[PDB]
Amino acid sequence: PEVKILVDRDPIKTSFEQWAKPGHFSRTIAKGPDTTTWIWNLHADAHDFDSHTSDLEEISRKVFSAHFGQLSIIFLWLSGMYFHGARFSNYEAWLNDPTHIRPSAQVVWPIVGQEILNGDVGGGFRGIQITSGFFQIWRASGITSELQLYCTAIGALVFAALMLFAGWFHYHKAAPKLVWFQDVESMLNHHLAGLLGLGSLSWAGHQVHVSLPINQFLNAGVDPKEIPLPHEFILNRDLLAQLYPSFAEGATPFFTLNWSKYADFLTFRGGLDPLTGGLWLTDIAHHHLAIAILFLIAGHMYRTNWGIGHGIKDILEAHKGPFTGQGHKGLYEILTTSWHAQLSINLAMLGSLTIIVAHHMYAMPPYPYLATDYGTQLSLFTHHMWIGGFLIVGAAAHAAIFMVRDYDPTTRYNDLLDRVLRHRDAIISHLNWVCIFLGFHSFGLYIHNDTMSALGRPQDMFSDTAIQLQPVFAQWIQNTHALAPGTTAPGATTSTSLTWGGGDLVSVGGKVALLPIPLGTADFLVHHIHAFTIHVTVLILLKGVLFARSSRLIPDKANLGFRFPCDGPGRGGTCQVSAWDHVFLGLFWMYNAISVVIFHFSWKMQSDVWGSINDQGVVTHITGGNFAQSSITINGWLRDFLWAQASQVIQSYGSSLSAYGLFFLGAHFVWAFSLMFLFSGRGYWQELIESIVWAHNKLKVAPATQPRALSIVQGRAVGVTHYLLGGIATTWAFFLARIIAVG
Amino acid sequence: INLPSLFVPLVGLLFPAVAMASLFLHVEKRL
Amino acid sequence: VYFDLEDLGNTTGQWDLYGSDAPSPYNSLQSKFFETFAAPFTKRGLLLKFLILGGGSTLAYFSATASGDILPIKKGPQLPPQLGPRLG
Amino acid sequence: YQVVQPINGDPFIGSLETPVTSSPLVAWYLSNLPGYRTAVNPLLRGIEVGLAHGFLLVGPFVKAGPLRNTEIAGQAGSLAAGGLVVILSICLTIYGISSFNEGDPSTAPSLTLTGRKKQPDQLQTADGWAKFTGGFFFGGISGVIWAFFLLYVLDLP
Amino acid sequence: SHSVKIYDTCIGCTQCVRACPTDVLEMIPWGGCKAKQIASAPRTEDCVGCKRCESACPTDFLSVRVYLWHETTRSMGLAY
Amino acid sequence: MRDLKTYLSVAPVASTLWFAALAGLLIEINRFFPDALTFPFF
Amino acid sequence: ASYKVKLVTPDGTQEFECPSDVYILDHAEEVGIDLPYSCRAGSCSSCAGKVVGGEVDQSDGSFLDDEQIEAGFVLTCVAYPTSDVVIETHKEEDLTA
Amino acid sequence: GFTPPELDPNTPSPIFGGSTGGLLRKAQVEEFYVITWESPKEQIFEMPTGGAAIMREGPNLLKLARKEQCLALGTRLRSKYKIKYQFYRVFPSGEVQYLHPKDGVYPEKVNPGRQGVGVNFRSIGKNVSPIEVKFTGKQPYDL
Numbered sequence A: 001p002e003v004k005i006l007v008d009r010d011p012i013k014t015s016f017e018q019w020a021k022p023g024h025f026s027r028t029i030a031k032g033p034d035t036t037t038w039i040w041n042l043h044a045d046a047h048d049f050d051s052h053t054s055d056l057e058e059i060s061r062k063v064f065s066a067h068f069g070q071l072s073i074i075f076l077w078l079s080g081m082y083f084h085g086a087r088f089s090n091y092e093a094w095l096n097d098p099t100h101i102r103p104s105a106q107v108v109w110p111i112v113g114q115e116i117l118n119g120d121v122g123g124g125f126r127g128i129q130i131t132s133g134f135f136q137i138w139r140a141s142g143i144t145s146e147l148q149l150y151c152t153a154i155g156a157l158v159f160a161a162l163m164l165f166a167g168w169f170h171y172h173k174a175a176p177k178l179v180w181f182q183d184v185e186s187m188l189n190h191h192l193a194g195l196l197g198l199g200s201l202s203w204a205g206h207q208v209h210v211s212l213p214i215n216q217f218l219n220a221g222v223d224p225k226e227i228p229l230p231h232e233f234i235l236n237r238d239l240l241a242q243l244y245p246s247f248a249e250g251a252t253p254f255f256t257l258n259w260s261k262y263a264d265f266l267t268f269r270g271g272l273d274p275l276t277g278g279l280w281l282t283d284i285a286h287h288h289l290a291i292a293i294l295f296l297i298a299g300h301m302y303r304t305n306w307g308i309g310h311g312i313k314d315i316l317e318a319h320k321g322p323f324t325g326q327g328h329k330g331l332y333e334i335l336t337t338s339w340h341a342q343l344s345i346n347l348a349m350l351g352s353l354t355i356i357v358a359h360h361m362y363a364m365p366p367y368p369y370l371a372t373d374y375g376t377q378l379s380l381f382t383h384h385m386w387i388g389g390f391l392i393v394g395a396a397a398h399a400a401i402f403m404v405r406d407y408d409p410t411t412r413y414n415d416l417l418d419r420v421l422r423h424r425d426a427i428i429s430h431l432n433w434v435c436i437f438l439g440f441h442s443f444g445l446y447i448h449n450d451t452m453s454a455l456g457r458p459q460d461m462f463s464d465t466a467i468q469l470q471p472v473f474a475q476w477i478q479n480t481h482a483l484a485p486g487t488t489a490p491g492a493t494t495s496t497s498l499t500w501g502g503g504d505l506v507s508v509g510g511k512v513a514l515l516p517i518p519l520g521t522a523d524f525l526v527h528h529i530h531a532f533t534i535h536v537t538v539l540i541l542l543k544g545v546l547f548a549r550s551s552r553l554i555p556d557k558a559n560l561g562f563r564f565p566c567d568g569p570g571r572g573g574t575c576q577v578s579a580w581d582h583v584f585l586g587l588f589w590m591y592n593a594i595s596v597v598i599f600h601f602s603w604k605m606q607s608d609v610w611g612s613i614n615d616q617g618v619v620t621h622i623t624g625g626n627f628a629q630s631s632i633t634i635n636g637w638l639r640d641f642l643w644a645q646a647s648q649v650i651q652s653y654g655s656s657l658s659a660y661g662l663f664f665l666g667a668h669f670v671w672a673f674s675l676m677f678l679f680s681g682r683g684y685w686q687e688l689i690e691s692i693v694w695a696h697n698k699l700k701v702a703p704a705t706q707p708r709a710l711s712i713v714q715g716r717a718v719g720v721t722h723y724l725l726g727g728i729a730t731t732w733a734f735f736l737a738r739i740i741a742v743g
Numbered sequence B: 001i002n003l004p005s006l007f008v009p010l011v012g013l014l015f016p017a018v019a020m021a022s023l024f025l026h027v028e029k030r031l
Numbered sequence C: 001v002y003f004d005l006e007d008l009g010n011t012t013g014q015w016d017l018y019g020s021d022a023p024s025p026y027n028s029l030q031s032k033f034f035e036t037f038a039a040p041f042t043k044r045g046l047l048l049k050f051l052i053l054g055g056g057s058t059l060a061y062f063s064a065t066a067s068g069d070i071l072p073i074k075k076g077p078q079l080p081p082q083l084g085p086r087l088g
Numbered sequence D: 001y002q003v004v005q006p007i008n009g010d011p012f013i014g015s016l017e018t019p020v021t022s023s024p025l026v027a028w029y030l031s032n033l034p035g036y037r038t039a040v041n042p043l044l045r046g047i048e049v050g051l052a053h054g055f056l057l058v059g060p061f062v063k064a065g066p067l068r069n070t071e072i073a074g075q076a077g078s079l080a081a082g083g084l085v086v087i088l089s090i091c092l093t094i095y096g097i098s099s100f101n102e103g104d105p106s107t108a109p110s111l112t113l114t115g116r117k118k119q120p121d122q123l124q125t126a127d128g129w130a131k132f133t134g135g136f137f138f139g140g141i142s143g144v145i146w147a148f149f150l151l152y153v154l155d156l157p
Numbered sequence E: 001s002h003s004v005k006i007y008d009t010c011i012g013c014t015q016c017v018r019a020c021p022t023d024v025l026e027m028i029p030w031g032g033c034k035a036k037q038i039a040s041a042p043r044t045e046d047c048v049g050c051k052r053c054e055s056a057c058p059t060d061f062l063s064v065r066v067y068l069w070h071e072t073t074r075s076m077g078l079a080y
Numbered sequence F: 001m002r003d004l005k006t007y008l009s010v011a012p013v014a015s016t017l018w019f020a021a022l023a024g025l026l027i028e029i030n031r032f033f034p035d036a037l038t039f040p041f042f
Numbered sequence G: 001a002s003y004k005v006k007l008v009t010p011d012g013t014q015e016f017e018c019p020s021d022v023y024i025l026d027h028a029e030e031v032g033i034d035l036p037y038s039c040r041a042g043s044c045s046s047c048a049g050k051v052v053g054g055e056v057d058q059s060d061g062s063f064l065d066d067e068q069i070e071a072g073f074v075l076t077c078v079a080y081p082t083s084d085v086v087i088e089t090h091k092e093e094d095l096t097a
Numbered sequence H: 001g002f003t004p005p006e007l008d009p010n011t012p013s014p015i016f017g018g019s020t021g022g023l024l025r026k027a028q029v030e031e032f033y034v035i036t037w038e039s040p041k042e043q044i045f046e047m048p049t050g051g052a053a054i055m056r057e058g059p060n061l062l063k064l065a066r067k068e069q070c071l072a073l074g075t076r077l078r079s080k081y082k083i084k085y086q087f088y089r090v091f092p093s094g095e096v097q098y099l100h101p102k103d104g105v106y107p108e109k110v111n112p113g114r115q116g117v118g119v120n121f122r123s124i125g126k127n128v129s130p131i132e133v134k135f136t137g138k139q140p141y142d143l
Ligand code: CLA
Pocket: B003, B004, B005, B006, B007, B008, B009, B011, B012
């Protein structure tokens, strides 16, 4: 019953003998190769732990140490970032004049003329302009010399070696047993209150003592070398009390409960800092304090060892009603015995979180001098949207794996799962219908618009000038968010973001940081397109999950596995009935949806947000503001967005942006190369390999590991992999060349 | 009296109408 | 137990779930009127041939004699035409 | 207690019972509609059908078509709804022609919700379907006529 | 209905009959092999044409063969 | 140690080493004799 | 090397000597104690059998349950006798269940 | 020669809650199938159409819509449980048809009362070319 550490000593012995025998984990691979197919299987099943064995203890041990390996890798990548900022960068000069020096932390050797890629990034330096936004983080951190960057690179290297050693240790010397892993209450109590609570408390601490004073000094105009070191602020406190008088009373308020006396540096202002175009640091510190309090309290909910707390089984069993039978009874047994269920829930939530991060970081810019660095903002939004989409699709993959390999009503029965399984037909019917209806009423409007614009009938269009479709609720909500500070939020001064409105515009260095974003007919059309794409992706993935075990077409589908090519050409033909094929199809639709999302954001920001402002105060946007009138037809997307903005990348040959021109074309090539794998089948290829093998046999030069054509599933997987790489890399080159060139 | 004013409609509207009802009734007929 | 070889329709579920089988709620003066006046359109071949040829009649008619306020294709051009890149 | 039950206690028919498909209000309503008035002359039901649907199909063709603002042609766009009525009654006719033959009984179910025999619904005939076709069509054109007759200003013409 | 044919190279391993999902195949006595067994296909009006039997046959070349032919309700696997 | 010598001769490691050495060789050749379009010797 | 093999069988129990690099079936073929086979390729259950002692190399065995090689059954025609073994014959159906 | 069992209606059915995967119009007008088995006790099992059902102690009688459904359920019942099953085809006439196992034995075991259907006495490499059968309706494998 009680909670304790439980470990085994020396489960596996460190040895090299298993390195020299490829495929030790699976009995079939261990036997050795006859054909080349072997070499592929060896890699495809490398991390399929619960298929190498049946024992849950072994799978969990492997998972734990694999996680340690991943963390060691991440630390090594961080070490590289800090070392490159310290050694091959122009960070100090950029610190001196942030709105003229464009950041760069990678230089190239002069080998074959490639030194042309070392371009003039300002500050007496020649290299590659980076878009990860690391200078903004390092400035918001208080870092002012390259010695601090060196120090953090060394610390990260140490931490990476530590992670690798712990990964070896917990697998070969002290391996925890199943009962240790299966304690979820203590785990949640630690991650809620220990990892997230103590983490943000410690970080709020660092912001109160380092970031806040060093940024106060930097915004005051002081030379970044004549600013005191951070530790001085801790040794001598009069330095702090000069900038914030409240630091004279020094924790007497926090006990005397007169927290009011800290209003110096813990504020609730809202809006941006009109000097750097970022959020007030005095708001972020107070935010982190509040979040830490909330998490530290929330990490005391579940019972571990002292009676007080909540039993998860009790909470789940308590919830049930007259529509759902016995629901939630039997989910604790499931969520503690399958890793795939846990992975699906976790992937779904982390993907959604990443998308939310993208939106919130464009709309309320956290770092100083990030809002006016347009390339970094575009890069960050796009990167995080792609990551979120991929993780959401993996969620479906592992829900399907759970349904095929783990669901079992004979020993672990849950009611809600059973009822959803018992009306899946109606579920899929209604979702299918709503996607068809949503597709007619959003893309159809575009087709109507194109045809009315080509037929010389613009008064019959769907636009702000002819037939208006104003999103009344969105306008109503942002009007409520405009009037909020002072009426429904008396403690706030400015509202949360500048996109809500109120007529407030923030500029930095003659550039536009933020201003109110206008919603119109075009915004209405684009958002309904987005609803359409998300609904279709959901239909494909949920159909794959709900029918993973059986169908009216193939009534014993679970016996064929999770990843199989087909069940033959009979029954009419049954290619791609497996759930793996549904994941394979959903990847294309996720690509479609995310691509449209990033195109909508990129065109809208340049058209109505970004630009340059004059001393008289007349804003000139990068594009002329043509999103309201050209986004409503398809021809306007092809003409005013793709054709007009690809100019920067198709003209980079000879400049320092020529690598983007090379990658544009390479990515087009890789995309078109995948269609060969996607459009064909392996019978043709094996028959061609036959004749090539004959030719080799004619000269006693034929190989002993007989060459085969790829698998059916491998053909599909190579196809989708190259398709995604080609498409995403094309958009990557286009975006980066375009945004870097104009500004 | 405008010649396309008559031929474009009926070849565009009624010819396919009659031909589609025609072929539907024929193709779903069990002799 | 829902299997009875004698009555098959109850075993395979041939019910009418929403039919009524109640008497007519349209009292006969109203029904009288309709089934008197609405009869001649109740033969299949009759209705089909009539509908086709009458719809075609109305379409050819309203197409040959539509006015300019309706169809810009009828009002013709009202401007002098341009010359092409060389020709015209 | 639970709300969803298998259809009439038979848990091996491909359906269920809910407050959406078997509820007293919904049952009584759907029962008193023309399509579910089994014991009534096909032509009367068709008349109700065509009336309601011509009247309904008036509005959109008027308030959205190409001549919506031109009102020397804005209101008389009921021509369009008349044409739509004509077209889908031609479709009704060919459907009935292909789906039935007079020398064959009507395919409707003979059992009721409790297990009593019914006289098969005659709308599923060939004869009665042609009768219902005539009824729907008569109603549709004259309903177009009726809702064009009310051109008097109300709240939104 | 599809066609299924058995050829005299059969070694009577029964692997094809175990695999059929619609019970088309059958073992019958014979005298041409060590097993005194041979496959037969008496019920080809129920064959969905999945070729699950052909994937199971070990002889080179195959001893059971499925030729897809005219389609019906049972052959297409329709539940409606 | 013998097992390590075997492992180092497995296909991916062997090819990695072979091509890294080849790359160094061609890189140094081109660093010494840059921009060659012809055989200018004989 | 050439360990002695023991096969219970309805005919009795007989021994024959035969090197470890061989399959059991061809070695019972040598001395002439008849056994039931169909495939000789490891893709059916006619040559099935279980063990009394020792254990037999089943590297090149296929079409078996992820257990049939951990609870006793063995196919005689794809099996290398690593030890002085003692095995069963005519064991298909109590394997077929 | 192995009289086949009769269909005994009034045989109870498993305990199911209903599902949208069961019979449809094809069972009203074309055909459907019926499986019966023994079930030493009451136990839970996965329906070949939807979720889970409870089979009753004693005879069990299920109505499905395809032969493949019956056979997949029977395979599950016969290996994971040790149960004997039979299934039948019922027409809209009210006519039953014992279907499986046909002659009392399972087809993977050779029974001495069976004839050969679809057996060619030659190898597959000895079929004629299509040119030999052109304009006459046979097929090269017909022989
Ligand atoms: C295959 C040759 C051919 C083609 C491609 C066309 C194409 C066209 N004709 Mg034309 N026509 C043709 C032959 C052809 N015609 C001949 C031989 C005559 C008699 C000398 C005419 C007399 C004619 C008139 C009076 C008019 C057109 C018009 C038109 C245009 C409007 C579309 C239409 O209403 O269809 C054509 C309508 C017809 C009544 C043509 C009927 C006569 C031809 C022979 C019918 C052939 C159908 C045949 C059974 C199918 C052949 C198979 C194959 C074509 C698929 C269109 C671009 C209209 C126009 O100018 O638009 C602005 C117009 O009013 N046509």
